[PDB]
C-alpha cells in the first residue's frame, strides 16, 4: 500500500499516479 511504498520507503511519481482517479 501507499504508506509502505511512499512513507516507510522512498516514494515515486509512478506510485503516486497509481492513486489518482
User: What angle (nearest 5°) sits at the alpha carbon of residue 11, between those of residues 8 and 15?
Assistant: 115
CB of 17 to another protein, least distance (A): 7
CB of 12 to another protein, least distance (A): 6
Do 5 and 15 form a contact (C-beta atoms < 8 A)? Answer: yes
Cell of 13: 511519481
Residues that bind another protein (CB under 8 A): 1-3, 6-13, 16-17, 19-21
Amino acid at each position: 500500500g501507499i504508506v509502505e511504498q511512499c512513507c516507510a520507503s522512498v516514494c515515486s511519481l509512478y506510485q503516486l499516479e497509481n492513486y489518482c482517479n
